[PDB]
Design a protein around this ligand. Structure first.
Ligand code: U2F
Ligand code: 3RL
Length: 440
């Protein structure tokens, strides 16, 4: 059986998507996968659980920890430096896999581009698995040109960027690392993007129906740009441990529940949580809120008791796919990470977008202004979303007209998603078409 080597960047939001791509390759095709995991610290309980829970057809190998004195900041800088100072280790592991097995392809995420030259020299075709939107990839291919054209900090450009096929995008909504051009994060992001050209191919976790403008542009505007294969949506099955959630949801009316969840990475102040609490309570709507500390002793006086009729508070974690696929669940208040968004798209759940970090502000603009499947609260000058504004936008989504229009559009995308990932879907076919080249 041919071997595909996957080198995730350190961090769960790089690892999980690539693990799920791995599970698709071994489920649909006759391949084995070896994960080589660069690390800044010895394996976590979280990592070991996830990795030991994989099919036997997916081997894993934590690489020597990078001596933390070899570090001089943003995740972009941490991740990039982990890859650089793990290059010897990966070469060594690849060299040995290559002699003891047929390695047919290497797959990295957007920060693993250092490996591309190295993989070519050893006659292994390198591929990028892009875990965000076609719009986001297109923005990144354009960022070098944009760096030469625009000399101000991008939030001071009053004119929006209008990429072919895309919604207008104001500079304040550009990716996090591009919001300080003096930080190392910006220079590292540029260095990686300039190497995207070296990939045999770029997988994108999206589909034609969802981003036709950006996909047309990526596949036609430039011959410099590698082949681009939309093969999404790929999301976890969500069938595992935990939780009173599903019991609670079985007692609620159809489409009546707002699911409220930010990532593990999404951190709200005690102040913003308490505004969100009062805001949910006065909306009059039912809600399931995954509450992470800034167990519920920090929440407003009386609130936990006042909302027992109509809301459920979960500490730490909830079965997201099970919540979103429940018939009770009518809306999702999310940070717009792309895996959370894709889960919500394939279950037809319309959104309230509250972007926090990474490329979320761009995802928010795309979902609100482009696809019109999301609403969006207005923060006051100081950055805080007020209770009154939360209540307004919750009611607008759960009982209002803009909600109906968004839900209708989100169901249309839901049916596209089911179609493209079926036995003869565009996404299923195109992955099978690229993977077949590897089998021989
Ligand atoms: O209580 C919970 C909370 C989460 N989950 C699950 O964890 C996953 C979270 O995915 P999400 O895209 O929201 O976060 P993350 O992967 O960190 O996003 C980054 O990585 C993304 C891909 O690179 C990028 O687009 C984004 O901007 C980044 F932030 C998703 O599979 C949820 O179902 C859950 O089951 N229960
Ligand atoms: C700077 O633009 C991006 C950042 C990121 C970074 C995501 C991330 C995920 C998990 C973490 O723990 C830290 C950062 C992802 C992107 O699309 C795949 C684009």
């Amino acid at each position: 059986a041919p071997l595909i080597v996957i080198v995730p960047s350190p961090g769960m939001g790089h690892l999980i998507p690539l693990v799920e791509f791995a599970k698709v390759l071994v489920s649909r095709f006759h391949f084995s996968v070896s994960l080589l995991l660069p690390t800044t610290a010895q394996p976590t309980k979280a990592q070991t659980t996830l990795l030991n829970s994989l099919p036997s057809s997916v081997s894993h190998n934590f690489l020597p920890t990078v001596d933390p004195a070899h570090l001089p900041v943003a995740h972009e800088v941490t991740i990039s430096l982990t890859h650089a100072h793990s290059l010897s280790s990966i070469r060594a592991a690849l060299g040995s896999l290559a002699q003891q097995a047929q390695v047919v392809a290497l797959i990295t995420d957007l920060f693993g581009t250092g490996l591309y030259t190295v993989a070519r020299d050893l006659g292994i075709p390198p591929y990028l698995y892009f875990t965000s939107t076609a719009m986001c990839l297109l923005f990144l291919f354009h960022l070098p040109k944009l760096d030469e054209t625009v000399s101000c900090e991008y939030r001071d450009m009053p004119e929006p960027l209008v990429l072919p096929g895309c919604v207008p995008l104001h500079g304040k909504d550009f990716v996090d690392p591009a919001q300080d051009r003096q930080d190392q994060a910006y220079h590292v992001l540029l260095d990686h993007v300039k190497r995207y050209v070296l990939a045999e191919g770029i997988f994108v976790n999206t589909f034609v129906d969802l981003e036709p403008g950006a996909i047309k542009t990526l596949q036609t505007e430039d011959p410099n740009v590698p082949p681009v294969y939309p093969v999404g949506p790929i999301i976890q099955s969500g069938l595992d441990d935990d939780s009173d959630c599903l019991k609670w949801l079985d007692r609620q009316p159809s489409g009546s529940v707002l699911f409220v969840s930010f990532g593990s990475g999404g951190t709200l102040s005690n102040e913003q949580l308490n505004e969100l609490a009062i805001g949910l309570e006065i909306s009059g709507h039912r809600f399931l809120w995954v509450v992470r500390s800034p167990p519920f002793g920090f929440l407003p006086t009386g609130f936990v008791d006042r909302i027992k009729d109509r809301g459920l508070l979960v500490p730490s974690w909830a079965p997201q796919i099970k919540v979103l696929s429940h018939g009770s669940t009518g809306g999702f208040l999310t940070h717009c990470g792309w895996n959370s968004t894709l889960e919500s798209i394939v279950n037809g759940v319309p959104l309230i977008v509250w972007p926090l970090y990474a490329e979320q502000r761009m995802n928010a603009v795309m979902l609100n202004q482009g696809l019109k499947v999301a609403l969006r609260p207005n923060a006051s000058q100081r950055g805080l979303v007020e209770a009154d504004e939360i209540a307004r936008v919750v009611k607008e989504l759960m009982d209002g007209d803009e909600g109906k229009k968004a839900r209708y559009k989100m169901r249309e995308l839901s049916d596209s998603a089911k179609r493209v990932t079926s036995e003869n879907g565009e996404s299923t076919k195109l992955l099978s078409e690229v993977a077949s080249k590897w089998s021989q």
